[PDB]
């Protein structure tokens, strides 16, 4: 008996003292001191001030630079858009509610902010999956007469939207649900209550397998094969100093991407492991929300790694910031 249940919410605090209030009606300052809600606000401000420009600039320099508009880059624009859903559907709403100390938009606002913030993060996730599939296809050439073009790259983007809707949309119609989470200032999928009426258990399993396990396997396989192919090819051309240089930098970049993905991925896996063993206790506000706190920062560091470290975008972005010169 660690928390307080109500219709459409679960406050991770016991009501034995009678102080708990609906997170839709009154501030949750028994979960956390006001200054900690402010620090939640400050963190959201940081993510907005870094996350909007980087992702907006990614869309903006693609409009100004013809050479960026290649099919292999479409999935990166999708990534930028997904991050902006997170920045505006998620961080902005949470900055605003955090300063009230509760989710001031009510259960309807909870579904909206939950849906769009879950959709944004899901589209990003699957964009990294699809980008890895695309790079694997282009480099390892597993179809003999195949050339990756505009129509294929559109399919990849559409695919991320289907996968993201497949996670974000069921809680809207009765499989899982959106509720306040953590300090009750933002809304998300309910993996926190063993709700039976909406079959929460099977959605968590389905999330775990399809939207957590499968992405990691596909990302590791595609990039593993790719590094193997590039090393193998470079080994056959050891007379080419640039081939060796290119190999070293492809390898080093895959390592950064995979480690970045694990930095986002392992906190969920560590916390989920706690859920299987050490089931006994129930704990909050944080909880499995430690990964979520840090997974939000992927709206900032993913564009840094996949876009800002891409040689083309960097030079185009410099040209654009410097009003066309240098």
Ligand X SMILES: *C(=O)CCCCCCCCCCCCCCC
Ligand Y SMILES: C[C@H](N)[C@H](C(=O)N1CCC2(CC1)Oc1ccccc1O2)c1ccc(Cl)cc1
Ligand Z SMILES: *[C@@H]1O[C@H](CO)[C@@H](O[C@@H]2O[C@H](CO)[C@@H](O[C@@H]3O[C@H](CO[C@H]4O[C@H](CO)[C@@H](O)[C@H](O)[C@@H]4O)[C@@H](O)[C@H](O[C@H]4O[C@H](CO)[C@@H](O)[C@H](O)[C@@H]4O)[C@@H]3O)[C@H](O)[C@H]2NC(C)=O)[C@H](O)[C@H]1NC(C)=O
Interface with ligand Y (CB under 6 A)? 118, 121-122, 125, 167, 189, 191, 204, 207-208, 211-212, 264-265, 268, 272, 295
**Distance from C-alpha of 110 to C-alpha of 257, rounded to nearest angstrom:** 32
Closest CB 50 distance from ligand X, rounded Å: 10
List Cβ<8 Å contacts ≥24 apart for 168-175.
168/115, 168/118, 168/119, 168/122, 169/115, 170/203, 171/111, 171/114, 171/115, 171/118, 171/198, 171/203, 172/111, 172/115, 174/198, 175/199, 175/202, 175/203
Residues 302-321, interacting with ligand X (CB under 6 A)? 318, 321
Minimal CB distance to ligand Z: which residue?
18
**Binding site per annotation, positions for Zn(2+):** 201, 279
Choose, by CB under 6 A, the member of 3, 4, 40, 247 that binds ligand Z. Answer: 4
Q: Which is nearer to ligand X, 210 or 318 (CB)?
A: 318
Closest CB 137 distance from ligand BOG, rounded Å: 16
Choose, by CB under 6 A, the member of 124, 137, 164, 234 that binds ligand BOG. Answer: 124
CA 300 to chain centre: 10
Minimal CB distance to ligand Y: which residue?
272
Residues 6+ positions from 72 with CB-CB distance below 8 Å: 134, 135, 138, 148, 153
**Distance from C-alpha of 99 to C-alpha of 27, rounded to nearest angstrom:** 10
DSSP code, position 210? I
Judged by CB under 6 A, does residue 22 bind ligand BOG? no
The SS3 call for residue 235 is helix
Closest CB 143 distance from ligand X, rounded Å: 42
Tell me the β-bridge partners of 181.
186
Residues 18-47, interacting with ligand Z (CB under 6 A)? 18, 20-22
Q: Residue 177 touches which of ligand Z, ligand X, ligand BOG, none (CB < 5 to 8 A by kind)?
A: none
Q: Residue 22 touches which of ligand Z, ligand BOG, ligand Y, none (CB < 5 to 8 A by kind)?
A: ligand Z
Q: Which is nearer to ligand X, 282 or 321 (CB)?
A: 321
Q: What is the DSSP annotation of 118-139?
A: HHHHHHHHHHHHHHHHHHHHHH
Residue 76 parent element (H or E): helix 71-86
Name the residues that contact ligand Z, by CB under 6 A: 4, 6, 15, 18, 20-22
Name the residues that contact ligand X, by CB under 6 A: 318, 321-322, 326
């Amino acid at each position: 008996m660690c928390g307080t249940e109500g219709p459409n919410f679960y406050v991770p605090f016991s009501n034995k003292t009678g102080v708990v209030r609906s997170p839709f009606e009154a501030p949750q300052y028994y979960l956390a001191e006001p200054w900690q809600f402010s620090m939640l606000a400050a963190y959201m401000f940081l993510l907005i001030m870094l996350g909007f420009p980087i992702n907006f600039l990614t869309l903006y320099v693609t409009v100004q630079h013809k050479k960026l508009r290649t099919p292999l880059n479409y999935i990166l624009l999708n990534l930028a858009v997904a991050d902006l859903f997170m920045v505006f559907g998620g961080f902005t709403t949470t900055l605003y509610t955090s300063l009230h100390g509760y989710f001031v938009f009510g259960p309807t606002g909870c579904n909206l902010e939950g849906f769009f913030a879950t959709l944004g993060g899901e589209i990003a996730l699957w964009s990294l999956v699809v980008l890895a599939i695309e790079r694997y296809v282009v480099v390892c050439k597993p179809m003999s007469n195949f050339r990756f073009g505009e129509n294929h790259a559109i399919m990849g983007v559409a695919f991320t939207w289907v996968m993201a809707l497949a996670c974000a949309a069921p809680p809207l119609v009765g499989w899982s649900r959106y509720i306040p989470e953590g300090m009750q200032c933002s809304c998300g999928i309910d993996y926190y209550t063993p709700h039976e009426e909406t079959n929460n258990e099977s959605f968590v399993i389905y999330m775990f397998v399809v939207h957590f396990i499968i992405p990691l396997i596909v990302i590791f396989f595609c990039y593993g094969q790719l590094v193997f192919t590039v090393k193998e090819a470079a080994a056959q051309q050891q007379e080419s100093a640039t081939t060796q240089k290119a190999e070293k930098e492809v390898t080093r970049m895959v390592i950064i991407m995979v480690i970045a993905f694990l930095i986002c991925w392992l906190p969920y896996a560590g916390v989920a492991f706690y859920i299987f063993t050490h089931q006994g206790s129930c704990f909050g506000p944080i909880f499995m929300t430690i990964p979520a706190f840090f997974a939000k920062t992927s709206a900032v560091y993913n564009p840094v790694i996949y876009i800002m470290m891409n040689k083309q975008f960097r030079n185009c972005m410099v040209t654009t910031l410097c009003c066309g010169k240098n």
